[PDB]
Design a protein around this ligand. Sequence first.
Ligand code: SF4
Ligand code: SF4
Ligand code: SF4
Ligand code: SF4
Ligand code: SF4
Ligand SMILES: [K+]
Ligand SMILES: [Zn+2]
Lengths: 114, 94, 112, 386, 38, 154, 206, 145, 94, 176, 48, 45
Amino acid sequence: TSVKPIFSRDMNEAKRRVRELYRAWYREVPNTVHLFQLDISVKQGRDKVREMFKKNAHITDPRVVDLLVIKGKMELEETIKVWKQRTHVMRFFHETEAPRPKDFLSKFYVGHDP
Amino acid sequence: GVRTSPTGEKVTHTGQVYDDGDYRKVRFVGRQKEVNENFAIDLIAEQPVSQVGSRVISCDGGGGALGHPRVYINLDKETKTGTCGYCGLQFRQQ
Amino acid sequence: LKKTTGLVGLAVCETPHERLKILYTKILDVLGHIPKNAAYRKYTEQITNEKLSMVKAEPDVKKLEERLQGGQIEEVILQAENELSLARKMIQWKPWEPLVEEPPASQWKWPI
Amino acid sequence: SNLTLNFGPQHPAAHGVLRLVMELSGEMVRKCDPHIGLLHRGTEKLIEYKTYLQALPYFDRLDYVSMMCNEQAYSLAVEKLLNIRPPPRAQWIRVLFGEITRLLNHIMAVTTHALDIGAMTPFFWMFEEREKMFEFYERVSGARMHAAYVRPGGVHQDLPLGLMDDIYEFSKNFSLRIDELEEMLTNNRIWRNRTVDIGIVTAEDALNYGFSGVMLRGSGIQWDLRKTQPYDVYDQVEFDVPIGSRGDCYDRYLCRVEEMRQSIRIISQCLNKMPPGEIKVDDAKVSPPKRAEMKTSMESLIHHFKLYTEGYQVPPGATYTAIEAPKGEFGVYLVSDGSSRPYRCKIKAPGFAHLAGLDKMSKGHMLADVVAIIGTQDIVFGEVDR
Amino acid sequence: QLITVDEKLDITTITGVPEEHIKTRKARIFVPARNNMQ
Amino acid sequence: GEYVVAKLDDLINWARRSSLWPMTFGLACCAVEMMHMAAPRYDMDRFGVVFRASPRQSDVMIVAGTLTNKMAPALRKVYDQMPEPRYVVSMGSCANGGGYYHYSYSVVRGCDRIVPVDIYVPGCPPTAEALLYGILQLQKKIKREKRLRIWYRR
Amino acid sequence: RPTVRPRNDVAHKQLSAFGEYVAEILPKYVQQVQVSCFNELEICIHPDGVIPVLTFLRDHSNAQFKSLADLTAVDIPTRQNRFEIVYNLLSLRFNSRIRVKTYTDELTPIESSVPVYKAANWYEREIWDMFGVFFANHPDLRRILTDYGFEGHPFRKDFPLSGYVELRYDDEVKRVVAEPVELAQEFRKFDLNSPWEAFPAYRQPP
Amino acid sequence: GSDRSRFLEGKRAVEDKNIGPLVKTIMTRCIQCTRCIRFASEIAGVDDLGTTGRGNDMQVGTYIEKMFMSELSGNIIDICPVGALTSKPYAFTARPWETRKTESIDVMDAVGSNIVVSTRTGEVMRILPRMHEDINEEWISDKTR
Amino acid sequence: ASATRFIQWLRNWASGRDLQAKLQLRYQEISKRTQPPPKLPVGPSHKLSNNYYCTRDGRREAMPPSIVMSSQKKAVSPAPPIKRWELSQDEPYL
Amino acid sequence: TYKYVNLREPSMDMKSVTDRAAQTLLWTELIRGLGMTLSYLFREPATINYPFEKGPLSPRFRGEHALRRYPSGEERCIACKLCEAVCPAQAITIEAEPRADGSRRTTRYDIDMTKCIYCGFCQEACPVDAIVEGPNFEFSTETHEELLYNKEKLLNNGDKWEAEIAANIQADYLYR
Amino acid sequence: EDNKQFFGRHRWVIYTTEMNGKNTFWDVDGSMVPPEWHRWLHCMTDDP
Amino acid sequence: SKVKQDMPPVGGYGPIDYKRNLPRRGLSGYSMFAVGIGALLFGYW
Ligand code: SF4
Ligand code: SF4
Ligand code: SF4
Ligand code: SF4
Ligand code: SF4
Ligand SMILES: [K+]
Ligand SMILES: [Zn+2]
C-alpha cells in the first residue's frame, strides 16, 4: 500500500487543493455567464458547481482526489481562456434531454432497462 | 413474377410487402417503391435441363474463370435432376 | 580553417585539438568521483582515453576526423560536452546501484 | 494581445483546419498555441476492430496527399511481423509509385505554399500534372487517390499493359514543369523576401524537437531513411539527397524542388529496371490466390475464404517501422497479439512533431511569417490528428 | 517519497463512464465455452 | 401577374445558379478532389463558381471531409453567418453519413445532423468530376425553384 | 527462400551486445533486455528510471540517441500496471534505433521526459488525453486531440468504440448539443479467432 | 496443410441421402471420418448408419431409404467435422463469425442442459450444446436443439 | 499542337524555352485505351513437386524475442558509426 | 550521396556587382517572371467541356455498386457473406434463407453508400463476381435516404449497367 | 471524335433534346449517356 | 503461350531530363544601364 503520490501526501493535504479549486470555480461563474452570455443565472451556475463537487464527496483516496482536482483545473482553464464555446459550457445542464423515469413503475412502462 | 397486394403495392421477389395497417408505406406517397422485375427464381426455371451421358458432370457457370467455382454433380438418381448449387442449371443423365 | 560546419547553429572552432584536450581531461576528472566498479566509469574512461590518445597523435584536423569517426570536429566537441554533462548527472542518479524494484510477475509477458 | 488564425484560407485548400491561438506584441508573434484535434477521428482505436487487411485503407486517409507511401509503411510493418518478403517486381512497383507519390506531395506542398503567400498561378500549372498522376493511380487501382494498392505481401494487381510507357511520357516533360515553377519563385525577390531567414531552426534543436525529413535536411543534417535505412529496392537506385545550409523556409523550399528532380531521376531507373514476375508473395496463407485458382482448386478456395473473413494471423510481437515519407519520417508502432487483428497501432506522423515546433520556429517573426512557417512544414492534419 | 493508502482502489469517478453504466450493469467473467461445431 | 412572376423567377434563378460562389470547408481528403475541380482540367470558375470567396460572400457551403464533434460547433457557426439564399453540398462518405469513421466516438455521423444539406455527393473521395456533377445538379435544383410563384399565391 | 524474410545475424549480435552494455551501466532501473527476431532492441525499465535512462541514451558517446521518434502507450487491462509507456529513439550517429519501455497504472504519475526531448511535449499530452496517464512536471499538460469537456480516455480498452455521447444541432436551444449515443445500426461484433493454434513457437505453458 | 493444390483430375461426386427433416446431407462433402456412425451406434444406440461400398466409392448412409429420427439425432450435426451433415432449419441463415453467443440453460426438460444461444442483430439463430461433464456432456436433445 | 507558327515563336520567346518539344497536353503518344490481353507469370511456389509448405513457411520461422538480460569488456555502440556521405559527382552545387 | 541546394558565394568583382545592381534597380528578374505567365496565356488550356467531354477512366475504376446475374438471369450472389465480412466500413448488411426452389439466396442485401469507402474489397472477396463496383460515378442525390441501397436498387443497377460492367470485367479479369 | 485534339477533348457527345419524355434542350447531364456508349466516352475502350 | 507483362522496351527507355535548366538571358548590367541612360538622354534632348 506504499504508493507514489501525485500531489497530496494525505487527505488533509488533498482537501486543501479541493477548496482552492472550489473558490476558483465559484468566482469564475459570474464571468463565465457574462463572457459566454449564458441564459442561466449566476446562482444556477454555482448550484451546478456545487452539484459536481458534491457527487465526489465520498472519495477517501488522496491520489484519486488529486486527479479529480487536476481534471477540474483543466476544465477551469478551458473556460477561463475561452477555449470552450457556448455549446461546451451548456453541456452540464442537459437542457434538451427529457427527464428519465427513476421509480420502478415508470421504468417498467417505458422499457426493459432497470 | 411481380404482383400486387390488395392495397396495390408490388410484392418483391423476397416476398416483402407492407400490410394494410402499416404506416411505413407513407414513404412511397408521391414517390415509388423500387422493385426489380426480373425474378431470378422464374428465369432459372426457364432454362432447359441438359442431357449428358455420364454419372458425374461438372459446372463452372460458363465463362471459365468468369463463372463460379467448379463443382461436380452426381446424376445417379433418375427421379430428379442434378442442380448446380451456384447457378441453378440442371442436368440429367441420358 | 573551414568556413562552415554545414550545420545551422554549429560554429566553427579555431582550436579544435586544444578544446578536445580540455573536455576529455575534464571528463576523466569527473569520472574519478564514480565508484571504481561502476560500469559507467570503466566504459566511459575507456572510450574517453581512446579519443584523447587519437587527439594527441594526430595534428591535422582533417586526418583526425577520419580517426574519430564522429563527423565534423565540432560535432565531436559537442559530443564530448554532452558526455561531460551526462557524467555529472550520473553522480546524482547513481545508476550502478542494485535494481530499485522488480516488476510484477507478468509485467513484461506478451502475449497475455 | 491575442488573435486566432482562421481555420483555412478563403481559396480552396486541402490540408485540414487549424485553430492557432496567437500572442502578439505589435507586429511580432510572442507565442503560438496550435489547438489541433479538429480532424481527430479515432483511427487508431478503429484499427483495433479491423483485420490487418481491413485496416490498410485507414492509412490512405492519414497523409491523404501521400497515399501509397502511407500504405507502404504499414505494409512493411506487417510484412516484418509476418516474417515474409514481397516479390522483387512488387518492390520495384512500390518504389516507382513511392516516387510518383513524392511528386504528388511535393507539388501540393510547394504550390499551396506559394498559393497561401499569394503566388497563385503555379498552383494551377502544377495540378494539371497532379491530374495526370492521379490517372496513374486510377489505372493500377481504379481509384484516383485512395488506392489501397500496396498491401502486406506486395501489390494488389499488376500494372496494366501500356502503363509504363505513359509514365515515361509524363516523366519526359516533367522537369520543364519544375523549371517553370522555379522561374516564378526561385529568384523572385518577393518570394525570397517571404522565405529567406524565416523560421530558422538549428541542427541540434531540430533533432531534439523530433523533426525529420526536410525539416532536418534544411538545417544541414545529412539524414535520409532511404539512404541510411533502405527498404524495398531503394538501395538499387541512384539519387542525391538535397541539403540546405541556412535552415530557413527558403532552403527547405529548394530542398523540396530538388527532391522532385531526384524523384524523376529515380522514376527513370524504376522504368528501366522493372523486372518480371509475380506481384504478391507466392504464399496463399498471406496473399490471396488468383481468382482462377480460387475457382478451380480446393486449397485456393479455402485460403481465399479464410483470408477474406478471418484474415491472416500475425505472430505475436511489436515493431516500429518507418519510411522516408514525403513529409518526413512516417512510422507505425504495430503490436500483434497473435490473432488476425492488430492489438495496438500507433501512427507516428511526421507533422505531429513539426507542428509542435511552430511556437519555437515563429519566435520574433511577423504575423504573416507564421503563414510561411506552417507552409514550409507542409502539415496535413489528417496525419497530425489521426 | 512513497505514501500509504489503506483504501480500496476505486476509479469510478475518474473514468468518465456515466453513472447508470456503472451501477446498473452486470459483468460476466468466464472462460468462453468451446464452439461445439469445431 | 401570373406571367410576370414566372419570367421573374426565371431571371433570378438564372442569376443565382449562374453565379454560385462557394465556401469550402477543406476538412480532409475530399478537399483534395475539391481542389482538382478548381484546377485547369475542370475549371469550376468557367461555370461561374469563383475560386475564393469568403464566408460572408458565399452562396454554397461545400462540406468536403470528415466533421468531428470538436469541429461541429464551428461549422454550424459559419453556416449561421452565411447570407441567404445559402446551400450546403455534402461531399463524400464522411460528410454524407460518417463513412469509414461512422462508429467513432469523435465523429458526427453525417453533417446533416448539423446543417440542412441540398446535395449529397457519394464517393471516398468523389472524383473531381463527380463533385462537378453534384454542383451542376444543384444548379438544376435552383432552376426548379419558384419563390415568387409561391409568394404571389399566398 | 524467395517468400521468407532473410535473417540478419550481424545486427542481432550487435544489438544484443549493446543491450548488455546498457544493462550493465544502468542496473538500478533496467529490468529486462530483449531483441526480436527482426532485430529490434527493447529495454524494459522501472518507471523511476525514465529520465536517467533516456538521458544516458541521448548523451552517452556510444549511444547518441538524439531523436525521439515516437512516444506512445499501450493499454493491457489484465496487468496490474495496465499502461505500457513506449519510447522509440533514433541514433543518427550509429544508424540505429532503440525502444525503451516502462509501465504505470491509473493513479501513478510518470516523470515528464520534456527535459530530455522537447519532442515529448505533445506526445505526453496525447498519452494523457487518450489514456489518462499523468506526467509529472509537464509544462502544459492538457487534452490535445479530444473535444473540450470530453469525459474519459478513448484509447483505453474498456472505452466503447462509439463512446457515450453524440452531437447534433438542436433548433430549440439554437446550438450544438450532446446526448447519449444511439445508433440506427449497431456495430456488428465479429468473432474471427480460429479455435486452432497458429504459432507453436509462442505456445504458453499449460 | 499446404497453401495450394496439385490435383489435376476430376472429383468424386456422390448422391445425397434423405434422413429426415432435421439433418440435411450433402454427402459429397463427407470425408469418411465415421464420427456419425460411431455416435449413432454408441451414444444414441441406433445402428442405422454405416458405410456401403469400398475404396474411393465408400459412402456413408443407411443404404435403404431410412430416416435417422432419434431424440439425440441432431448431435451428428455438431460432430460431423465438415458440411456433410448440417441443420436443415438453420440452413443458409447465418455465418459463424457474425453471431453473438449467449451461454444459457435449456428448459425443455428438467435436465438443465447447458446451451449456447446464437443470436445475430437481435434474433435467435440456433441453439448449440455447451459442454458440462456432469449434466449433458456436449450433447443436447432434438427438442432443445 | 494547333498553334500558329507565330504564336509558337511568341510563347517560346516569352518563356525562354522550346515549349513545343515538351507539350504538357497529350496527343497520340499515349497508350491505346484497348490493349492485348496479358498473360501474367506465376510465382516460385507454383511447383508440382519439391514444394512442401513447411520448407517455405515464413510465419512459422518467427520466434519470440531473445532475452539478453532478465531480472526475474570493451565498450560497444549499437552499430558501427555511420560512414560519411560523399558529395554528389552529378551536381554537387545547385 | 548529397548535394547543396544553396551554397553559392556571390562574385564581388565590379562587373558582377553591377549585374546585381541592375537586377535590383531594373527589376529584371521580375520581368522574367512576367514572361512565363505571358507564355501561358498563349498556350492551349487543359480544360475539358464537361459534361459533353469526360475525364478518361480505366476498366478498373471503382464506382457505383451493382449486383450481377448469370446469362440465364439467375442471380450470381449465393449469400456467402464474404463481402459483408471483409467490408472495412461495415457498409454491407445481408440476410439469407432457402429460396422456394431450395436455392441459397439473399433476402436482404443492403449497402449504406454513405458508409462505404469505395475500396473494392467486396468485389475482390466475392467468389462468383456477384457484387461489383460499376463505372457510374454520377449518382449524387438530394437526400441522405436515397444513398441507402437495398437489394432491389442494387439488382436494378446490375440490370442497368451490365452491358458496360461485363465489358470492363472482360478487359481486366486476367489481371485478377 | 477528333484525334487531332489533345487527350480528354478528342471525344465528346452532343446530348439529345428529348430523353424519356423530358425536355433536355437546356437541361443535359452526364447520366444521360447509356452504358454501351459510357465506356467509349470515358476512354475505358477504344472501340465504340 | 508466352507470358505477357508490362515491361520496358528492349534497350530501355530514352533519356529523361531532371536537372535544373534556367537559361541565361539578357544583357550585362553595364549594357542595361547604358541603354537606360541613353533612353533618358534622348528623351531629355
Ligand atoms: S469521404 Fe473518404 S476521401 Fe473524403 S475525407 Fe472521408 S475518408 Fe477522406
Ligand atoms: S461425421 Fe460427417 S464427415 Fe464424418 S463420416 Fe459422418 S457425414 Fe462423413
Ligand atoms: S466449409 Fe469446410 S466442409 Fe464446407 S466446403 Fe469448405 S472445406 Fe468443405
Ligand atoms: S467498396 Fe469497400 S467499403 Fe464499399 S461496400 Fe465494398 S468492401 Fe465495403
Ligand atoms: S455478393 Fe458475393 S461475396 Fe457477397 S454474399 Fe453474395 S456471393 Fe457472397
Ligand atoms: K457439420
Ligand atoms: Zn453452375
